[PDB]
PDB file of C-alpha atoms and ligand atoms in Angstrom:
ATOM      1  CA  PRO T   1      96.735  82.945 109.840  1.00 54.44           C
ATOM      2  CA  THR T   2      96.823  80.949 106.571  1.00 56.61           C
ATOM      3  CA  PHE T   3      93.070  80.282 106.139  1.00 55.27           C
ATOM      4  CA  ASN T   4      90.446  83.049 106.172  1.00 52.99           C
ATOM      5  CA  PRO T   5      92.826  85.831 107.242  1.00 54.19           C
ATOM      6  CA  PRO T   6      90.872  89.058 107.714  1.00 55.48           C
ATOM      7  CA  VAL T   7      91.606  92.172 105.649  1.00 59.24           C
ATOM      8  CA  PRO T   8      93.655  94.255 106.045  1.00 60.91           C
ATOM      9  CA  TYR T   9      96.331  91.544 105.934  1.00 60.83           C
ATOM     10  CA  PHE T  10      99.864  92.134 107.310  1.00 62.69           C
ATOM     11  CA  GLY T  11     102.293  89.285 106.607  1.00 62.10           C
ATOM     12  CA  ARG T  12     105.941  89.294 107.744  1.00 61.98           C
ATOM     13  CA  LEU T  13     108.158  87.686 105.068  1.00 64.52           C
ATOM     14  CA  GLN T  14     110.916  86.100 107.176  1.00 62.42           C
ATOM     15  CA  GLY T  15     114.428  86.783 105.855  1.00 62.87           C
ATOM     16  CA  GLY T  16     113.163  89.167 103.162  1.00 63.38           C
ATOM     17  CA  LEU T  17     111.579  88.483  99.784  1.00 63.20           C
ATOM     18  CA  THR T  18     113.617  85.692  98.226  1.00 64.06           C
ATOM     19  CA  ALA T  19     114.145  84.979  94.551  1.00 64.13           C
ATOM     20  CA  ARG T  20     111.957  81.948  93.702  1.00 66.73           C
ATOM     21  CA  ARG T  21     109.639  82.627  96.687  1.00 66.65           C
ATOM     22  CA  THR T  22     106.021  82.152  95.647  1.00 67.59           C
ATOM     23  CA  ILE T  23     103.025  83.842  97.236  1.00 70.00           C
ATOM     24  CA  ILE T  24      99.555  82.316  96.824  1.00 70.09           C
ATOM     25  CA  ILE T  25      96.465  84.425  97.406  1.00 70.27           C
ATOM     26  CA  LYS T  26      92.992  82.921  97.040  1.00 71.90           C
ATOM     27  CA  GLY T  27      90.076  85.270  97.476  1.00 70.69           C
ATOM     28  CA  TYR T  28      86.703  86.647  96.470  1.00 71.39           C
ATOM     29  CA  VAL T  29      85.819  90.063  95.064  1.00 75.31           C
ATOM     30  CA  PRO T  30      82.516  91.351  96.545  1.00 80.11           C
ATOM     31  CA  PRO T  31      79.666  92.493  94.242  1.00 81.11           C
ATOM     32  CA  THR T  32      80.021  95.953  95.813  1.00 79.51           C
ATOM     33  CA  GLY T  33      83.829  96.120  95.567  1.00 81.09           C
ATOM     34  CA  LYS T  34      85.524  99.135  94.032  1.00 79.99           C
ATOM     35  CA  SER T  35      89.232  98.477  94.725  1.00 80.42           C
ATOM     36  CA  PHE T  36      91.758  96.316  96.552  1.00 80.36           C
ATOM     37  CA  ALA T  37      95.561  96.251  96.682  1.00 80.56           C
ATOM     38  CA  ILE T  38      98.404  93.805  97.238  1.00 83.13           C
ATOM     39  CA  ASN T  39     101.665  95.569  98.233  1.00 85.57           C
ATOM     40  CA  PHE T  40     105.133  94.053  98.501  1.00 83.49           C
ATOM     41  CA  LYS T  41     106.496  96.478 101.133  1.00 83.34           C
ATOM     42  CA  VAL T  42     109.792  97.327 102.820  1.00 84.27           C
ATOM     43  CA  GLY T  43     108.725  98.192 106.397  1.00 81.80           C
ATOM     44  CA  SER T  44     111.573 100.577 107.374  1.00 81.24           C
ATOM     45  CA  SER T  45     110.857 103.016 104.525  1.00 83.25           C
ATOM     46  CA  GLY T  46     107.257 102.266 103.537  1.00 84.95           C
ATOM     47  CA  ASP T  47     108.479 101.704  99.950  1.00 84.22           C
ATOM     48  CA  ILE T  48     106.454  99.353  97.720  1.00 84.46           C
ATOM     49  CA  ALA T  49     108.396  97.204  95.191  1.00 83.08           C
ATOM     50  CA  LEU T  50     105.093  95.992  93.688  1.00 87.36           C
ATOM     51  CA  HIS T  51     101.621  97.487  94.166  1.00 85.12           C
ATOM     52  CA  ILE T  52      98.900  95.390  92.417  1.00 82.09           C
ATOM     53  CA  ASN T  53      95.588  97.267  92.365  1.00 81.72           C
ATOM     54  CA  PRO T  54      92.494  95.783  90.767  1.00 80.40           C
ATOM     55  CA  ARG T  55      89.810  98.450  90.322  1.00 76.92           C
ATOM     56  CA  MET T  56      86.254  97.277  89.541  1.00 74.88           C
ATOM     57  CA  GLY T  57      84.831 100.572  88.134  1.00 75.19           C
ATOM     58  CA  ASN T  58      87.001 100.416  84.991  1.00 75.56           C
ATOM     59  CA  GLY T  59      88.092  96.744  85.317  1.00 75.58           C
ATOM     60  CA  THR T  60      91.765  97.677  85.493  1.00 78.45           C
ATOM     61  CA  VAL T  61      94.633  95.753  87.026  1.00 76.47           C
ATOM     62  CA  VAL T  62      97.026  98.568  87.990  1.00 74.19           C
ATOM     63  CA  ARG T  63     100.695  97.814  88.738  1.00 74.16           C
ATOM     64  CA  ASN T  64     103.116 100.403  90.053  1.00 71.02           C
ATOM     65  CA  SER T  65     106.000 101.008  92.486  1.00 74.87           C
ATOM     66  CA  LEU T  66     106.445 103.411  95.384  1.00 71.52           C
ATOM     67  CA  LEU T  67     110.213 103.897  95.539  1.00 69.38           C
ATOM     68  CA  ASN T  68     112.178 106.844  97.001  1.00 66.85           C
ATOM     69  CA  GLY T  69     108.771 108.184  98.200  1.00 68.34           C
ATOM     70  CA  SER T  70     107.284 108.522  94.654  1.00 69.37           C
ATOM     71  CA  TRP T  71     104.872 106.554  92.439  1.00 70.19           C
ATOM     72  CA  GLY T  72     106.455 105.246  89.246  1.00 73.58           C
ATOM     73  CA  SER T  73     104.639 104.849  85.930  1.00 75.19           C
ATOM     74  CA  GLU T  74     101.564 102.581  85.864  1.00 76.58           C
ATOM     75  CA  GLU T  75     101.539  99.256  84.009  1.00 77.05           C
ATOM     76  CA  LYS T  76      98.056  98.137  82.991  1.00 79.23           C
ATOM     77  CA  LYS T  77      98.114  95.718  80.021  1.00 76.83           C
ATOM     78  CA  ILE T  78      96.392  92.358  80.694  1.00 76.14           C
ATOM     79  CA  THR T  79      95.036  89.493  78.540  1.00 76.91           C
ATOM     80  CA  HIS T  80      92.268  88.802  81.118  1.00 77.68           C
ATOM     81  CA  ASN T  81      90.597  90.294  84.188  1.00 79.43           C
ATOM     82  CA  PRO T  82      90.143  87.685  86.927  1.00 81.76           C
ATOM     83  CA  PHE T  83      88.795  90.263  89.441  1.00 77.09           C
ATOM     84  CA  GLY T  84      85.229  90.820  88.214  1.00 80.92           C
ATOM     85  CA  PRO T  85      82.866  91.824  91.011  1.00 78.66           C
ATOM     86  CA  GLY T  86      81.403  88.671  92.602  1.00 76.16           C
ATOM     87  CA  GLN T  87      84.242  86.422  91.407  1.00 78.00           C
ATOM     88  CA  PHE T  88      86.600  84.023  93.150  1.00 80.60           C
ATOM     89  CA  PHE T  89      90.290  84.170  92.077  1.00 82.73           C
ATOM     90  CA  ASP T  90      93.497  82.141  92.650  1.00 84.67           C
ATOM     91  CA  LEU T  91      96.668  84.263  92.294  1.00 80.66           C
ATOM     92  CA  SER T  92     100.189  82.855  92.142  1.00 79.95           C
ATOM     93  CA  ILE T  93     102.906  85.540  92.509  1.00 80.67           C
ATOM     94  CA  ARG T  94     106.512  84.463  91.829  1.00 81.74           C
ATOM     95  CA  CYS T  95     109.433  86.764  92.664  1.00 83.37           C
ATOM     96  CA  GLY T  96     112.047  86.174  89.938  1.00 83.94           C
ATOM     97  CA  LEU T  97     115.532  87.698  89.566  1.00 84.73           C
ATOM     98  CA  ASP T  98     114.408  90.190  86.894  1.00 82.49           C
ATOM     99  CA  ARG T  99     110.611  90.239  87.280  1.00 84.11           C
ATOM    100  CA  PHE T 100     107.544  89.292  89.250  1.00 84.49           C
ATOM    101  CA  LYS T 101     105.503  86.738  87.315  1.00 78.66           C
ATOM    102  CA  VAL T 102     101.809  86.717  88.188  1.00 81.96           C
ATOM    103  CA  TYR T 103      99.311  84.023  87.174  1.00 80.14           C
ATOM    104  CA  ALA T 104      95.581  84.080  87.929  1.00 76.12           C
ATOM    105  CA  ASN T 105      93.587  80.821  87.801  1.00 78.47           C
ATOM    106  CA  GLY T 106      96.634  79.104  86.220  1.00 79.26           C
ATOM    107  CA  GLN T 107      96.703  81.614  83.354  1.00 81.11           C
ATOM    108  CA  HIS T 108      99.451  84.188  82.925  1.00 81.78           C
ATOM    109  CA  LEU T 109      98.260  87.661  84.055  1.00 82.00           C
ATOM    110  CA  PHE T 110     101.385  89.861  83.933  1.00 78.59           C
ATOM    111  CA  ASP T 111     105.112  90.176  84.424  1.00 76.54           C
ATOM    112  CA  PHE T 112     106.443  93.194  86.332  1.00 78.69           C
ATOM    113  CA  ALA T 113     110.142  94.127  85.805  1.00 78.55           C
ATOM    114  CA  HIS T 114     111.874  94.815  89.110  1.00 78.23           C
ATOM    115  CA  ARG T 115     112.295  98.510  89.706  1.00 78.28           C
ATOM    116  CA  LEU T 116     113.669  97.956  93.206  1.00 75.86           C
ATOM    117  CA  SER T 117     116.748  96.014  92.050  1.00 77.11           C
ATOM    118  CA  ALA T 118     117.378  94.841  95.647  1.00 79.04           C
ATOM    119  CA  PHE T 119     114.168  92.757  96.066  1.00 79.68           C
ATOM    120  CA  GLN T 120     115.573  91.206  99.308  1.00 80.56           C
ATOM    121  CA  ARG T 121     114.676  94.487 101.060  1.00 79.03           C
ATOM    122  CA  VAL T 122     110.945  93.544 100.837  1.00 77.36           C
ATOM    123  CA  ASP T 123     109.817  91.968 104.131  1.00 75.36           C
ATOM    124  CA  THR T 124     106.116  92.956 104.274  1.00 77.51           C
ATOM    125  CA  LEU T 125     103.127  91.563 102.343  1.00 76.23           C
ATOM    126  CA  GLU T 126     100.088  93.772 102.682  1.00 76.59           C
ATOM    127  CA  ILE T 127      96.608  93.141 101.262  1.00 77.91           C
ATOM    128  CA  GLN T 128      93.942  95.824 101.852  1.00 77.19           C
ATOM    129  CA  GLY T 129      90.508  97.021 100.671  1.00 78.55           C
ATOM    130  CA  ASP T 130      87.517  95.281  99.072  1.00 74.57           C
ATOM    131  CA  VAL T 131      88.484  91.622  98.999  1.00 74.64           C
ATOM    132  CA  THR T 132      87.742  88.588 101.170  1.00 72.50           C
ATOM    133  CA  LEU T 133      90.642  86.164 101.539  1.00 74.76           C
ATOM    134  CA  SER T 134      90.125  82.413 101.862  1.00 74.03           C
ATOM    135  CA  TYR T 135      93.836  81.504 101.742  1.00 69.74           C
ATOM    136  CA  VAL T 136      97.259  83.214 101.781  1.00 67.42           C
ATOM    137  CA  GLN T 137     100.452  81.131 101.596  1.00 67.73           C
ATOM    138  CA  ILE T 138     103.683  83.114 102.061  1.00 69.03           C
TER     139      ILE T 138
HETATM  140  C1  LIG S 201      94.221 108.330  97.641  1.00 70.05           C
HETATM  141  C2  LIG S 201      94.533 106.864  97.607  1.00 70.05           C
HETATM  142  O1  LIG S 201      93.749 106.062  97.121  1.00 70.05           O
HETATM  143  N1  LIG S 201      95.708 106.526  98.142  1.00 70.05           N
HETATM  144  C3  LIG S 201      96.205 105.164  98.215  1.00 70.05           C
HETATM  145  C4  LIG S 201      97.087 104.927  97.003  1.00 70.05           C
HETATM  146  O2  LIG S 201      96.615 104.717  95.751  1.00 70.05           O
HETATM  147  C5  LIG S 201      97.287 105.229  94.581  1.00 70.05           C
HETATM  148  C6  LIG S 201      97.882 104.056  93.827  1.00 70.05           C
HETATM  149  O3  LIG S 201      96.854 103.094  93.559  1.00 70.05           O
HETATM  150  C7  LIG S 201      98.514 104.566  92.543  1.00 70.05           C
HETATM  151  C8  LIG S 201      99.217 103.449  91.779  1.00 70.05           C
HETATM  152  O4  LIG S 201      99.658 103.937  90.508  1.00 70.05           O
HETATM  153  O5  LIG S 201      97.497 105.173  91.741  1.00 70.05           O
HETATM  154  C9  LIG S 201      96.930 106.339  92.345  1.00 70.05           C
HETATM  155  O6  LIG S 201      95.921 106.883  91.491  1.00 70.05           O
HETATM  156  C10 LIG S 201      96.429 107.493  90.296  1.00 70.05           C
HETATM  157  C11 LIG S 201      95.636 106.996  89.096  1.00 70.05           C
HETATM  158  O7  LIG S 201      95.757 105.581  89.006  1.00 70.05           O
HETATM  159  C12 LIG S 201      96.144 107.648  87.813  1.00 70.05           C
HETATM  160  O8  LIG S 201      95.339 107.247  86.692  1.00 70.05           O
HETATM  161  C13 LIG S 201      96.130 109.168  87.970  1.00 70.05           C
HETATM  162  O9  LIG S 201      96.718 109.783  86.825  1.00 70.05           O
HETATM  163  O10 LIG S 201      96.883 109.539  89.131  1.00 70.05           O
HETATM  164  C14 LIG S 201      96.310 109.019  90.342  1.00 70.05           C
HETATM  165  C15 LIG S 201      96.967 109.666  91.561  1.00 70.05           C
HETATM  166  O11 LIG S 201      98.358 109.328  91.685  1.00 70.05           O
HETATM  167  C16 LIG S 201      96.310 106.005  93.702  1.00 70.05           C
HETATM  168  O12 LIG S 201      95.936 107.210  94.378  1.00 70.05           O
HETATM  169  O13 LIG S 201      97.695 103.629  97.079  1.00 70.05           O
HETATM  170  C17 LIG S 201      98.517 103.430  98.229  1.00 70.05           C
HETATM  171  C18 LIG S 201      99.199 102.054  98.189  1.00 70.05           C
HETATM  172  O14 LIG S 201      98.298 100.977  98.509  1.00 70.05           O
HETATM  173  C19 LIG S 201      97.703 103.608  99.498  1.00 70.05           C
HETATM  174  O15 LIG S 201      98.644 103.570 100.579  1.00 70.05           O
HETATM  175  C20 LIG S 201      98.230 102.645 101.586  1.00 70.05           C
HETATM  176  O16 LIG S 201      96.985 103.047 102.148  1.00 70.05           O
HETATM  177  C21 LIG S 201      96.509 102.174 103.167  1.00 70.05           C
HETATM  178  C22 LIG S 201      95.081 102.574 103.538  1.00 70.05           C
HETATM  179  O17 LIG S 201      94.278 102.558 102.355  1.00 70.05           O
HETATM  180  C23 LIG S 201      97.479 102.191 104.356  1.00 70.05           C
HETATM  181  O18 LIG S 201      97.381 103.444 105.049  1.00 70.05           O
HETATM  182  C24 LIG S 201      98.938 101.956 103.942  1.00 70.05           C
HETATM  183  O19 LIG S 201      99.829 102.455 104.947  1.00 70.05           O
HETATM  184  C25 LIG S 201      99.336 102.614 102.623  1.00 70.05           C
HETATM  185  O20 LIG S 201     100.446 101.907 102.053  1.00 70.05           O
HETATM  186  C26 LIG S 201      96.939 104.927  99.523  1.00 70.05           C
HETATM  187  O21 LIG S 201      95.967 104.899 100.569  1.00 70.05           O
END
């Protein structure tokens, strides 16, 4: 469902991940949270075009890919951390031709260059771990 979906979340993106398709995720990080993940998955393989992994221990926003069975190299640079324990966040994820563009609370968070060139393979949005979702629009 769109409002208050429980975690873990499993959303079927109908007709694949489309260029210009925007995902909105509004949620809350618990005081006790250590980690949660948002994966843009291809179901057949289990490959992940984009794994976004906020980790509260170090306050990192980890981005990586799981392609051909292997983890790529991690991208971590941010200008802000919207995922502090006990915080609400509003994430807007846009799938561009060349990159994902992610904004948190209307402020740019990161861009992630496509590693899976064929982004249309992605038909699975997965959100899992220590996060409470108020709203997910796919
Ligand atoms: C053990 C574990 O946590 N496994 C998770 C897995 O996480 C890995 C992922 O976050 C990558 C991204 O780069 O980092 C891995 O940690 C690395 C450190 O970041 C790095 O500094 C160090 O040098 O090396 C570490 C090891 O590689 C981290 O382990 O993430 C995947 C994707 O979400 C998880 O798979 C999913 O698991 C859920 C249940 O939790 C479901 O079973 C799903 O089917 C599956 O996609 C995995 O559990």
